[PDB]
Amino acid sequence: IFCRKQAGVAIGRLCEKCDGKCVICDSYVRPCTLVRICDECNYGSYQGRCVICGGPGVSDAYYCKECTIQEKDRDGCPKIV
Amino acid sequence: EEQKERKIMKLLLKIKNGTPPMRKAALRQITDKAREFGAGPLFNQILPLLMSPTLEDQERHLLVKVIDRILYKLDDLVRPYVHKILVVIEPLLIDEDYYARVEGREIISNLAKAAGLATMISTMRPDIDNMDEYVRNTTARAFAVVASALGIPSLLPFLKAVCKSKKSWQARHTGIKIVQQIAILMGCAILPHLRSLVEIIEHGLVDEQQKVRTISALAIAALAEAATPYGIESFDSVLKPLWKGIRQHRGKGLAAFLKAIGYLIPLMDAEYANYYTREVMLILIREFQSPDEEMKKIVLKVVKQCCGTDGVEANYIKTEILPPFFKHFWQHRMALDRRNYRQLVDTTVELANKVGAAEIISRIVDDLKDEAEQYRKMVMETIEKIMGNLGAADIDHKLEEQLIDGILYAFQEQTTEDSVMLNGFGTVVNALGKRVKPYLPQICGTVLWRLNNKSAKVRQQAADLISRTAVVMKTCQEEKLMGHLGVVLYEYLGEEYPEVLGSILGALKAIVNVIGMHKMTPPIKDLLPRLTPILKNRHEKVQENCIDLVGRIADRGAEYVSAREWMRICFELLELLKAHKKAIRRATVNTFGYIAKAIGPHDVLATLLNNLKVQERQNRVCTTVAIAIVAETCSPFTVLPALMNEYRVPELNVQNGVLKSLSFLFEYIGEMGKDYIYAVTPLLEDALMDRDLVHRQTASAVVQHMSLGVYGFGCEDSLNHLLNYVWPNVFETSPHVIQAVMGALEGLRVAIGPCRMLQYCLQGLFHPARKVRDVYWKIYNSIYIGSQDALIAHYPRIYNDDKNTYIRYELDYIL
Amino acid sequence: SKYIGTGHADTTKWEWLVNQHRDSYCSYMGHFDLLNYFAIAENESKARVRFNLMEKMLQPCGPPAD
Amino acid sequence: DQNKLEEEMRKRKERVEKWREEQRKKAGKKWSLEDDDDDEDDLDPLDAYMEEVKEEVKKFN
């Protein structure tokens, strides 16, 4: 359900609904590392959209502290397909 | 059969309205099919579908990729059709859509790579001499794309030949336009070929035709813009003609030559930059009086470009440039001119960034009082930009007085609520700081008059101003009529407009967040009971500001309110933890922490346990969060005994609630849990020995959160002890239990280390039963994907057999 | 499954052992002080030890069964 | 207080207007660079190179 292709410079975004909860482990405590997404998931009309519900993005997506500790930020683009 | 291949190459519909897997499958198969299909039918059908009037964006992208792949394979068979393809795709290069242009350029690039240079030149040469100006532009852009694809030196001979043509001036014009489009398209990649292009195009500046001279000057400007901050010894044979032309030409050609001069000047040294500026400067001063509203924009751009270099110093600028600039450009005619207004503001700011803020600021600050408000907003914008970029070190008594009087008069003379005057007032007062003591009475009178009435759109702007200036307002030991303002803001607490109520609450909070409760004149005991009914309002700004205010009051003025009301307020705040705006939740967490720190953990904890016992799911989850907050603000040594005493109650769904609360507690406190792992270990043992699936699933969740919470703190003993009870659950078929067990194992991989996990997996990796092998290889792959490097030091020794060598001998070396 | 070095219920001893030999050689090439240790132990230049490890990378543990 | 605030405004406005009166007494063809449109007013090396190219294309065919 995850895109997981090696990413790049595009910054993942979150919608107003879930702003501030992890994209991997969907958690409500301590954000750590900025989310990067693949270029295909940010191409064209997809730029700036929510990495969970493809809707309008209002904030930067983050991996939680527990995910970065477990290096779950190094597994590829976390855009849900 | 002919339509044979057509019916089978409907693969492009297989792709167009098709699934991604069959998309790529048909892509690969049609790539293998292309050489045999032949370019004739393929293009005969695809170019109509690409010419479809309502095609989509990504359908177009996929079609372009199909073109790319079917063009790579069939290389030299595309020649007899090139012309046709071009007439379809020579448009899409002047299209107002950026991605259409990218796709057209990619198509033309792959076409030029498939075919040869001679073919492209032979098909594109007849339209070089065309009279329709619409064709000569697409032709130049396509030649630029071909040069970018096949390289510049491959096209250099054709260029050198075409702009020496004595046959017609149209061919020369189009060749110079090709050079200009090459520059525009390739940018800083033209630097190795700069001198070649310059010597190819340089003889056009002295042509007998005026259109050739203009296009040559535009091409020189394009090359100089692509080359910057390098490239200057390649622009040497153009310096003499360009300056002689700006000395002799007049009009459109003069504008082109001046644009060229302006793009060339920043590439020189101080000498040449200083010497050349003088010449073009006398010419530009003469041209300050010409008519077209294009000429003004070009002159402003050139002034900004030249005044930003080192060869030009502030003395010459203030002596020669500032008087005519401010005499000719600063009139309200410039203000109603929306085209060059921003250009004038930027040019003036960048002038002040070199000559000094004082002169600019004076010359326009006398103009802040004006009959037209457009000219007022322009001056205010420029002034606040200069102030933000430089600050206000050089404000004099006279200048300070004038500034204050001007901003005060501008504030009152305001028709519609604008952010311009608000931000100007704010930054001026914030930059002056402790220096504005008597204009503090004056400003307080002004904001009192604005906040008294007039539709609450002036009142909310006054409240914003108070919120942003209260720091410097109190910074000078003046609060008193500070209290006079707070009284009026209090009276303005019943408002039908929530937007104005938000600003009122913000201003009140900014006041009290710097006004001591002793001397905060409205007695805290009276305010707070007036404040508690506002907590049930449903506007987000009102709610956030009310919660923040109650939090400040509970943090500092806790003594005045009799408790019980604090308990009611916290029990009401309990429901805001589920708010669907992070802000509301953040402020609620803060305020709950303050109230808990104020009234003490005992009573609130008793109430929270009672509330956790009797309510529905979401309220119980919020109660769990609240218990974790109380235990973090007041050390968990005050919460843990009362919470563990509740586990001694004999009922199911009661122990599971205690376990869920412990799970979230450890996840929420993180590092603080290092002192409390020994206390909860026997309870987790009991729960891990519990038959109920939820009891073991929740105990595994607790183990995971506890493991990831303490890491680097030396708690490995209890975690190994608990792993001894978690591990037997690996043979569980229930999905939720096994999910929690995997989570706990991956947390222990971090807290306990991969060596222990490998030691637990070794004997099962090669078990005779396939179930054991599946489970153990899943666990092992999870251990291997994380920390693959550490495992190098942990693998056990495996002896050589007759066929193969398995000992790692390097690690047996002994220095 | 897409990661090289992972196993499954049908993995044999030979595949496991060649996988750990191969990533052992890569770890030796990576870490600067392990290669120092080996080059001092067998009295060779470090470039020679690196080339020997790369040459051993191809068929560690001998050719497979049957 | 409101009456005093209204007075203060009246006086400031009057002072500004008097100062203004004091000062006052003391005292397009359209052409775009995005077009080739000129305002009013109105052997070969290209064929040789073209001939060289045409020769290459004919030879390949």
Ligand SMILES: CO[C@@]1(C)C[C@@](C)(O)[C@H](O)[C@@H](/C=C\C(C)=C\C[C@H]2O[C@@H](C)[C@H](NC(=O)/C=C\[C@@H](C)OC(C)=O)C[C@@H]2C)O1
């Ligand atoms: C119904 O919509 C869903 C389910 C899906 C969604 C992503 O679309 C939507 O945005 C999302 C938003 C609302 C909810 C309910 C989700 C997240 C929030 O939930 C709340 C119910 C929790 N409550 C707590 O966190 C407990 C304590 C507080 C104060 O926090 C903290 C950090 O102490 C956890 C979380 C903060 O919920």
Ligand SMILES: [Zn+2]
């Ligand atoms: Zn992606």
Ligand SMILES: [Zn+2]
């Ligand atoms: Zn979303």
Ligand SMILES: [Zn+2]
């Ligand atoms: Zn996470």
